[PDB]
């Protein structure tokens, strides 16, 4: 059975830092990009939509624009790794990685964001 | 692009009734069952997992046992229809129909359940 796995289902990140969250999927021999779909979302916000080798970068939800990318090198290793730069308080929540590759599955990853009072105070009022 | 569509994204149903929630996907001519995956969930509870022409009967969340089925005949028409019988208050929430068929997509459907006072003591949990 096609199974997506996550080495970590919980990440704790500091406000302003970068994060890479990972979901693994089975690749026998070499990856066939044309058969691969990778989708990342958080709470109904679309983050990544990689379809048959072509990424839709522009349909990323505006809160992630210019901050989120799929590490394409890692796909050939069977690793769907989502990198988010400049982590914000609004980035905390439950992410899902959905993968179709001759089989389909998804997993959840929880992200917690620590932040100092100044950042928390802005988030609190914005 | 492969697109799953829902004619309705909202269902309002009565406690104890039956519901059929529908999601469509494109099927050009003859369905290739071996390439089709249909998955239904609500709040990450597995309802339907139809893979390689076969349901996985033991993977269904216990709260849907005996009550939820995918109507297999509809699949060749490009209709992934989830039929839920004997609707309970716990069935209210946001459902997702996830389809892989030479392409992948999903849609969300909201279900509201109306119920009399007596049933409404789901309040006691
Ligand atoms: C067939 C299938 C089996 C399974 C069961 N997977 C296990 C292994 O973990 C097994 O077989 O024992 C599945 O599991 C989802 C799930 C996740 C987490 C917890 C539970 C539980 N309990 C269930 C989801 C699933 O279908 C998920 C699915 C189905 C169809 C399409 C997509 C999909 C993929 C990529 C997409 C997409 C949908 O739409 C937008 C564009 O990108 C997905 C994720």
UniProtKB/Swiss-Prot annotation, chain A:
The keyword Cell division does not apply. Its main location: membrane. Glycans are attached at residue 18. Ubiquitinated; STUB1 likely mediates polyubiquitination of PD-L1/CD274 triggering its degradation. Ubiquitinated by MARCHF8; leading to degradation. Deubiquitinated by USP22; leading to stabilization. Residues 2-110 form the Ig-like V-type domain. Keywords: Adaptive immunity, Cell membrane, Disulfide bond, Endosome, Glycoprotein, Immunity, Immunoglobulin domain, Membrane, Nucleus, Receptor, Repeat, Secreted, Signal, Transmembrane, Transmembrane helix, Ubl conjugation. Highly expressed in the heart, skeletal muscle, placenta and lung. Weakly expressed in the thymus, spleen, kidney and liver. Expressed on activated T- and B-cells, dendritic cells, keratinocytes and monocytes. Induction: Up-regulated on T- and B-cells, dendritic cells, keratinocytes and monocytes after LPS and IFNG activation. Up-regulated in B-cells activated by surface Ig cross-linking. The keyword Glycoprotein applies. One of its GO terms (molecular function) is transcription coactivator activity. It is found in: Cell membrane; Early endosome membrane; Recycling endosome membrane; Nucleus. It comes from the Eukaryota. GO terms for biological process: adaptive immune response; cell surface receptor signaling pathway; cellular response to lipopolysaccharide; immune response; negative regulation of activated T cell proliferation; negative regulation of CD4-positive, alpha-beta T cell proliferation; negative regulation of CD8-positive, alpha-beta T cell activation; negative regulation of interleukin-10 production. GO terms for cellular component: actin cytoskeleton; early endosome membrane; external side of plasma membrane; extracellular exosome; nucleoplasm; plasma membrane; recycling endosome membrane. Disulfide bonds join 23-97. Plays a critical role in induction and maintenance of immune tolerance to self. As a ligand for the inhibitory receptor PDCD1/PD-1, modulates the activation threshold of T-cells and limits T-cell effector response. Through a yet unknown activating receptor, may costimulate T-cell subsets that predominantly produce interleukin-10 (IL10). Can also act as a transcription coactivator: in response to hypoxia, translocates into the nucleus via its interaction with phosphorylated STAT3 and promotes transcription of GSDMC, leading to pyroptosis. The PDCD1-mediated inhibitory pathway is exploited by tumors to attenuate anti-tumor immunity and escape destruction by the immune system, thereby facilitating tumor survival. The interaction with PDCD1/PD-1 inhibits cytotoxic T lymphocytes (CTLs) effector function. The blockage of the PDCD1-mediated pathway results in the reversal of the exhausted T-cell phenotype and the normalization of the anti-tumor response, providing a rationale for cancer immunotherapy. Interacts with PDCD1. Interacts (via transmembrane domain) with CMTM4 and CMTM6. Interacts with (phosphorylated) STAT3; promoting nuclear translocation. Interacts with CD80. Belongs to the immunoglobulin superfamily. BTN/MOG family. It is linked to Truncation of the 3'-untranslated (3'-UTR) region of CD274 transcripts leads to elevated expression of CD274 in multiple cancers including T-cell leukemia, diffuse large B-cell lymphoma and stomach adenocarcinoma. Disruption of 3'-UTR region is caused by structural variants that stabilize CD274 transcripts, leading to overexpression. Increased expression in tumors promotes immune evasion and tumor cell growth by allowing malignant cells to escape destruction by the immune system. This is Programmed cell death 1 ligand 1. The lineage of its organism: Eukaryota, Metazoa, Chordata, Craniata, Vertebrata. The chain holds residues 18 to 134 of 290 of the full protein.
């Amino acid at each position: 059975a096609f199974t997506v796995t996550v080495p970590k289902d919980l990440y704790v990140v500091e406000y302003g830092s970068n994060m890479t969250i990972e979901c693994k999927f089975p690749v026998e021999k070499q990856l066939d990009l044309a058969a691969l779909i990778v989708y990342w979302e958080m709470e109904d916000k679309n983050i990544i939509q990689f379809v048959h080798g072509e990424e839709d970068l522009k349909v990323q939800h505006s809160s992630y624009r210019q901050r989120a990318r799929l590490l394409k090198d890692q796909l050939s290793l069977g690793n769907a790794a989502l990198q988010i730069t400049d982590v914000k308080l609004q980035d905390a929540g439950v992410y899902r990685c959905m993968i179709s590759y001759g089989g389909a599955d998804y997993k959840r990853i929880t992200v917690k964001v620590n932040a100092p009072y100044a950042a928390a105070l802005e988030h609190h009022h914005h």
